[PDB]
Each structure stands twice: as C-alpha cells, then as structure tokens.
Design a protein around this ligand. Structure first.
Ligand SMILES: [Ca+2]
Length: 460
C-alpha cells in the first residue's frame, strides 16, 4: 500500500534502481523489487531493493540522481512535489528528470517539462499523495516508537517489517536504524498469522478492542496508530461497552487515550470515529473547565471513568474496530411540513415543559423530533422557522437511564451535535432533557421543568 513505482507519463516508463550508482528507467513492472520505492521520512525516498535513499552530490544542474546511505540530516536526499507532478530537490527549482542527451540515468535538471513530472504508477496522483506515513509499533520495548526504515539486523538491511530472528512469524521493525546496536523494536501494525491475538473480540457484539498499555503516545499519534490498523480510538456508546472495557482494563492503572475530545472549537464533546456522544461516564470533576485539556483518557485505576487532559500527554491508548429518485413529494397533514419522508412542526404558541411538549406532539400524531443527520438538522434551522436565538425542546433525554441519552420516539441515537461546552450534565442540576439553541441549531442538555417552544416530527 505504501510502496510505489515512480512513473513518467510521457515516456511510459518507471524508475528502476540498477545499482547504488545506477538509477535508470525500464518498462514498468509492478513485481520488480528494483522498481519499488517508499517514503521513509517526510522528504526521503528509499529504494526497496537496495535499502538506500535517492540523492544527489550537490543541488546543481545536470548531476546524477543515485542511491546513498539514508541520512535524515542530508539536504541532498530531500525531495518535494512542486506544482502538481513536478518532482524536485527540496529548496531548489531543480528536478528529477529522464530523457535528455541520451542519458540513461535519472538526472537532476533545471528543466520543468513533462520529463520532470512523475506519478504513482497505477494512479493519477503525484508522489507526495502517498507521502510518508509513520508506522507506530505495538508492544515491544520502544513504547510505541515508529519504525525506522531501513534498519539493520544481523548486519542485513530491512526495508519493511520482518519476521527474521523469530520463531513465531510476528512482524517487527527496529525503531532506530541500528537494531544490532540499540536493540529497540516493536511489532508492526500489519496482518500476519497470529496478529489478531492483539485484539479482544467482544463475543456479544463482535466488536474488537486493542489495549496498548505499554505505549506512550500523544492523543493524535494514538489516533494515527488506530487509523492505520483500519480502526479508531475507542468510542463508548453503550453501557455494556463500558462494562466490557472496564473488565479488559481492570488490572491497569495508568491512563489510556480514548476517542472522546472537544477539539472542534464550535461544538461540544465528540468521538473521533463520529459516534454519537450519548453515554457519559466522567470522573468526578471532569469534564473540567480548563481550556487546554481537550482530549480524554480512560482511567483504568478509577473504574475506567473518563477525564480530559492535555492532548500532548504521552499515554497508552485503546483502539476499536438534484433530488434522489426516492425524494418524491411528501404528504403531510395541515400545519406540518415535509422533509425526507417525515413531517415537522414548531410549536411557539404556548411554551411547555418538556413532558407536556412531548404529550402535545404525541396527541397530534407525532413526537418530539429526533435528528439523525446534519441535513435534517439543517432543514430545521434553515427552512422550518427556527431563529438563531430560539431555544426549543427536541426528543433527546436521559430520563429512563441516567447518563444514557435516548430519543423519546425510540429510534436509535446515531448522531449528536452538541453546543460548545455541552452536554454539561452538571452534578445535581438534573440536566436530563435537551434543546436546540443558537444560530447553528446545536444541542444542550438542561433541566426539564422549564416552559419552552418545541419541535415535533412524524412519519408522512
Ligand atoms: Ca447544559
């Protein structure tokens, strides 16, 4: 996925590493290891066959591009994409070029024509689209540090993770260049026989969880580690899910990053996997009113309740794994208005407490509105008659099960859009009902015993 051939459209040829001193071109061959390259840092491109990096002797016109021992400090090994498909040495208008003066070697060249433009073979994208993706190690002795490609083991160089030196087939990488000297490694986030033993599958739900308690990563690094495993940071949307994760972490004490955060300045608490924030299990004193603490850790030594911390804290973490043809005219009863097969109405006449608003909607054949998409929310605010300074009941509430918000109409909660700072759900304030308020129609919990207007919904 992260190895690529380097393709020139005009010549219809791919780069081919012939030797450390001969980087040329050949008819493209997706199986040829000598045609395979990979980003091993932000700016370095490594030959997979040779475990050496493309570089130049100087940043000057018409010098050969060949292969050097990879060196992250060398300016002569740094490449960048200019315009779109122009490939050049960093910091100069000098380009990776093939075709001039009967020269079979790639040359660094002042020219910026089509012979200096390159794409990832099999795509329409430039090389920097499949840029460097740091690979965070699992278990091991390096606390989740990233693979250092290429790395040396038994005096041999590795361009990718390997099972060399092992009897169990597990794939690992050095987290420094010289593993022989430094002995720092971890296992790679890749598929291999036995790799699923890094996950715990809930038999009730078939959802899988990975508890990385030995790693020390920031919230954003931890998120990248889960993402590159086709996963995301833990989200917790059911009581059972919390109970299951409490048990899986019951012998741990240090904090574990989960996916909950307040990193969107204009909205409230949210899961990084876009799950609804509808279940709350905060530690006492959280979420705290401290502006820099926008990322949430599960504290396994305190019954796996949650606390918000500074995102740069290095912790373990937990992964979890034109109208449409159907938009036909919609029948609605008088005073109700259609959207996506349902009918809606705002009650402003007589403000009511939440439970009386609910009774009224139901006597009229509907219910307090549920809201399942941003488009449904946008219909309400932009067309239905909502004004920015409104505050109106919707159907979300945790009256039946404290800390577990549900829709009064019984439909699943699959979407939340909370105001900044919401849900606040402050101790002893009984904020068990929910309103839409403010110019964006975002939501807030609040006490249920206050007269307000409200929004009803029904099926057409
Ligand atoms: Ca509130």
């Amino acid at each position: 996925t992260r190895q690529f051939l380097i393709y020139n459209e005009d010549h219809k040829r791919c780069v081919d590493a012939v030797s450390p001193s001969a980087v040329q071109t050949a008819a493209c061959n997706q199986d040829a290891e000598s045609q395979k390259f990979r980003w091993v840092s932000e700016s370095q491109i490594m030959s997979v066959a040779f475990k050496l990096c493309l570089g130049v002797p100087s940043k000057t016109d018409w010098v050969a591009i060949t292969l050097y021992a990879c060196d992250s400090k060398s300016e002569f090994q740094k490449w960048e994409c200019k315009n779109d498909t122009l490939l050049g040495i960093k910091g100069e208008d000098l380009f990776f070029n093939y075709g001039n003066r009967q020269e079979k070697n790639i040359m660094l060249y002042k020219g910026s024509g089509l012979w200096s433009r390159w794409k990832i073979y099999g795509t329409t994208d430039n090389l920097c689209s499949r840029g460097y993706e740091a690979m965070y190690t699992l278990l091991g002795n390096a606390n989740g540090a990233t693979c250092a490609f290429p790395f040396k083991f038994e005096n041999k160089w590795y361009a990718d993770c390997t099972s060399a030196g092992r009897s169990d087939g597990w794939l690992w990488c050095g987290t420094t260049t010289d593993y022989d000297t430094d002995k720092l490694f971890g296992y790679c986030p890749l598929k291999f026989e036995g790799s699923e033993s890094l996950w715990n599958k809930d038999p009730l739900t078939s959802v899988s969880y990975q508890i990385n308690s030995k790693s020390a990563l920031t919230w954003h690094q931890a998120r990248k580690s889960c993402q590159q495993q086709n996963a995301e940071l833990l989200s917790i949307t059911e009581i059972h899910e919390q109970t299951y994760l409490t048990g899986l972490t019951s012998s741990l004490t240090s904090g574990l990053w989960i996916g909950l955060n307040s990193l969107s300045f204009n909205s409230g608490w949210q899961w990084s996997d876009r799950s609804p924030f509808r279940y709350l299990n905060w530690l006492p004193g959280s979420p705290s009113a401290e502006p820099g603490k926008s990322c949430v850790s599960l504290n396994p030594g305190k019954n796996a309740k949650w606390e918000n911390l500074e995102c740069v804290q290095k912790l373990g973490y937990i992964c979890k794994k034109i109208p449409s043809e159907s938009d036909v005219p919609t029948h609605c009863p008088s005073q109700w208005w259609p959207y996506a097969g349902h009918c809606y109405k705002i009650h402003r006449d007589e403000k009511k407490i939440q439970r009386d608003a609910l009774t009224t909607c139901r006597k009229e054949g509907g219910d307090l509105t549920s809201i399942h998409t941003i488009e449904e929310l946008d219909f309400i605010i932009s067309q239905l008659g909502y004004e920015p300074n409104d505050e109106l009941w919707i159907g979300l509430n945790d009256i039946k099960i404290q800390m577990y918000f549900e829709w009064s109409d019984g439909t699943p909660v699959t979407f939340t859009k909370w105001l900044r700072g919401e849900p606040s759900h402050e101790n002893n304030r009984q904020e068990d009902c929910v309103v839409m308020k403010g110019k964006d129609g975002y939501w807030a919990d609040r006490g249920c015993e206050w007269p307000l207007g409200y929004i009803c919904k029904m099926k057409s």
